């Protein structure tokens, strides 16, 4: 819960090159491809009967871009993070009843969309500190229950 | 399951990182010794600085066993079976830390050849490195 | 994987519930529907109340099931591949949700056939529920 | 983290009538055998080359005790889980690294424990209960990373 300097600069220099909505829609995309239950949750995004498809589906690119930019919403509120969530968690929670398991792999999806994207820069020291973002992040999600 | 297509995706994949097994198995090592501190307490006896030989020497036997089980895809509890038992018996390895170790190497190929992970490739990536997972700790499973 | 010894403990523990396949059936899903509430929502079309017919019927089923499964239990894939593509394909299960109800079950036979539920039964029953887990849903994992 | 008074004396009045002593020997021994990858952390405890060597071991039965008296002031301080646990914490994550879903293993072979030690007595709505007070335990303990 606590964010040493380093941590920061690592985490906020990398998202202001972040192409929220590639790397948004590529992520969305991946977890419906790899984790095929989770498209139960998108069946309002219509047609998702193919990887083509759903890489090619408007409303999955759309919502990844949405779900990209509630990240970004956590870069800034880095200490803030439980109260910029907690209307995600109870719709997450409550309406969907989205298993906290699948957090955790959206946002490992999410580290390997950003390594794709950003190679050798993405060094070791970068990825433990986003990989501990995605857990804070999933972790105030996950909260409904605690 | 592994599909036709899953097969042909992980060789397609696994070719073009055969020839840097040492180079790709230390990076992978030392991102998961870096984003997953807990696995360090299953190497005690090696030094675990940064570019250490014993992490180079590990990392190239690691990914020589991962080459060895996409070459008998078919069978791929048969062609590691005695990791199984290392690994399960004697090691006692967390389940867990498989899908760590998996995760991390995908990240290095992110890294390295991104054209080549595409979104389909990945999921059949991901569905062998838990195929693997499964054999080496299937002892106790 | 299943030993030989594994094979013969669920055989063991299954021949004293054949006898009472809808009653069982029915209190594991309960406790399923009670304690993991979330599982409610893949039967929207159900009478989720205490004592439905509805829960009564299908808890028959899944048992049912589980037999089958215990009978063919060398090739267990074989012998629920039409029940793989209905969880897996058509309904999109969460595989999470497998776990849950293999508790619940293995809560109910504690509860009824405590002496038949030694340590090492429980660890055969864990690993035949979490081989059919894996079938269940293998068509995506 | 809120408790329905329906839960506080399900919980509560199931609590008096457990043995400690047995429900804790054989909770854990249970683990070390369902569960073998989990015999790495116990290897001070001396022979658990069988199920019958670990069930006979006096030091597994002696730790079994402990585990489910520590059970019994979470059960004492419903409201004051975490203070109660915040050493334990610590120990498990700092000093021994047991991964947190260890812990949700645990508290569910304790569920069937106390099921074959109760049989009917133990409803699907006791049995609710008390798989919350296990994943409350479980994330009292897994906070030293939150
Ligand atoms: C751990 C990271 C996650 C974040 C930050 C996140 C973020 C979001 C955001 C910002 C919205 C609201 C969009 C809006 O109001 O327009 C949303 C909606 C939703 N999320 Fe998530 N989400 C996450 C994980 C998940 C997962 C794993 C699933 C599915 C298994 C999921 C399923 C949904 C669904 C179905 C909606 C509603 C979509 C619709 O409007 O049709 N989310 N999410
Ligand atoms: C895809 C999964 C893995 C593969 C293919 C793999 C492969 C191997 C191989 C080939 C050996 C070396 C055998 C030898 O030198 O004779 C080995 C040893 C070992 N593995 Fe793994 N391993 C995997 C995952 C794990 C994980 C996740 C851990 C723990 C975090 C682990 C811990 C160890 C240890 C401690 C050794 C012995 C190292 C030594 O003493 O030199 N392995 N593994
Ligand atoms: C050991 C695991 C399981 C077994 C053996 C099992 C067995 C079955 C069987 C035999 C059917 C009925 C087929 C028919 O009526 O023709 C079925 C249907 C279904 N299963 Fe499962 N199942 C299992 C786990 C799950 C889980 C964990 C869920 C979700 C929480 C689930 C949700 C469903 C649903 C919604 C249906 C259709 C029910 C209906 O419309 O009548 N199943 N399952
Ligand atoms: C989720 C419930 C858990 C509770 C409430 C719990 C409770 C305890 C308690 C009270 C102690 C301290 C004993 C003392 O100071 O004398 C302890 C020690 C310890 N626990 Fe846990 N524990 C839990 C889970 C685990 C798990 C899952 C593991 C192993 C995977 C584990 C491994 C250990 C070890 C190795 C010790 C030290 C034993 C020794 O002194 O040699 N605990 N635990």
Same mark, same amino acid.
């Given at each position: 819960?606590?964010?040493?300097?380093?941590?920061?600069?690592?985490?906020?220099?990398?998202?202001?090159?972040?192409?929220?909505?590639?790397?948004?829609?590529?992520?969305?995309?991946?977890?419906?491809?790899?984790?095929?239950?989770?498209?139960?949750?998108?069946?309002?995004?219509?047609?998702?009967?193919?990887?083509?498809?759903?890489?090619?589906?408007?409303?999955?690119?759309?919502?990844?871009?949405?779900?990209?930019?509630?990240?970004?919403?956590?870069?800034?509120?880095?200490?803030?993070?439980?109260?910029?969530?907690?209307?995600?968690?109870?719709?997450?929670?409550?309406?969907?009843?989205?298993?906290?398991?699948?957090?955790?792999?959206?946002?490992?999806?999410?580290?390997?969309?950003?390594?794709?994207?950003?190679?050798?820069?993405?060094?070791?020291?970068?990825?433990?500190?986003?990989?501990?973002?995605?857990?804070?992040?999933?972790?105030?999600?996950?909260?409904?229950?605690? | 399951?592994?599909?036709?297509?899953?097969?042909?995706?992980?060789?397609?994949?696994?070719?073009?990182?055969?020839?840097?097994?040492?180079?790709?198995?230390?990076?992978?090592?030392?991102?998961?010794?870096?984003?997953?501190?807990?696995?360090?307490?299953?190497?005690?006896?090696?030094?675990?600085?940064?570019?250490?030989?014993?992490?180079?020497?590990?990392?190239?036997?690691?990914?020589?066993?991962?080459?060895?089980?996409?070459?008998?895809?078919?069978?791929?509890?048969?062609?590691?079976?005695?990791?199984?038992?290392?690994? *399960?018996?004697?090691?006692? +390895?967390?389940?867990?830390?498989? !899908? #760590? @170790?998996?995760?991390?190497?995908? &990240?290095?190929? /992110?890294?390295?050849?991104?054209? *080549?992970?595409?979104?389909? +490739?990945?999921?059949?990536?991901? !569905? #062998? @490195?838990?195929?693997?997972?499964? &054999?080496?700790? /299937?002892?106790?499973?």
């Amino acid at each position: 819960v606590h964010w040493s300097a380093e941590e920061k600069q690592l985490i906020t220099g990398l998202w202001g090159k972040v192409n929220v909505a590639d790397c948004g829609a590529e992520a969305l995309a991946r977890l419906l491809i790899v984790y095929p239950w989770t498209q139960r949750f998108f069946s309002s995004f219509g047609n998702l009967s193919s990887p083509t498809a759903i890489l090619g589906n408007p409303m999955v690119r759309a919502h990844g871009k949405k779900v990209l930019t509630s990240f970004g919403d956590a870069v800034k509120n880095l200490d803030n993070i439980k109260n910029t969530f907690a209307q995600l968690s109870e719709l997450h929670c409550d309406k969907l009843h989205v298993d906290p398991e699948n957090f955790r792999l959206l946002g490992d999806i999410l580290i390997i969309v950003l390594a794709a994207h950003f190679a050798k820069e993405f060094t070791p020291d970068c990825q433990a500190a986003w990989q501990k973002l995605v857990r804070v992040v999933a972790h105030a999600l996950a909260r409904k229950y605690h | 399951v592994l599909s036709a297509a899953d097969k042909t995706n992980v060789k397609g994949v696994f070719s073009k990182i055969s020839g840097h097994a040492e180079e790709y198995g230390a990076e992978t090592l030392e991102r998961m010794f870096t984003a997953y501190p807990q696995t360090k307490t299953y190497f005690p006896h090696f030094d675990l600085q940064h570019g250490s030989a014993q992490i180079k020497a590990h990392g190239k036997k690691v990914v020589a066993a991962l080459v060895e089980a996409v070459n008998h895809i078919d069978d791929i509890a048969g062609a590691l079976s005695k990791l199984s038992n290392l690994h *399960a018996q004697k090691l006692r +390895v967390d389940p867990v830390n498989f !899908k #760590f @170790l998996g995760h991390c190497f995908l &990240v290095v190929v /992110a890294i390295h050849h991104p054209s *080549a992970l595409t979104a389909e +490739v990945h999921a059949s990536l991901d !569905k #062998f @490195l838990c195929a693997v997972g499964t &054999v080496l700790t /299937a002892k106790y499973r």
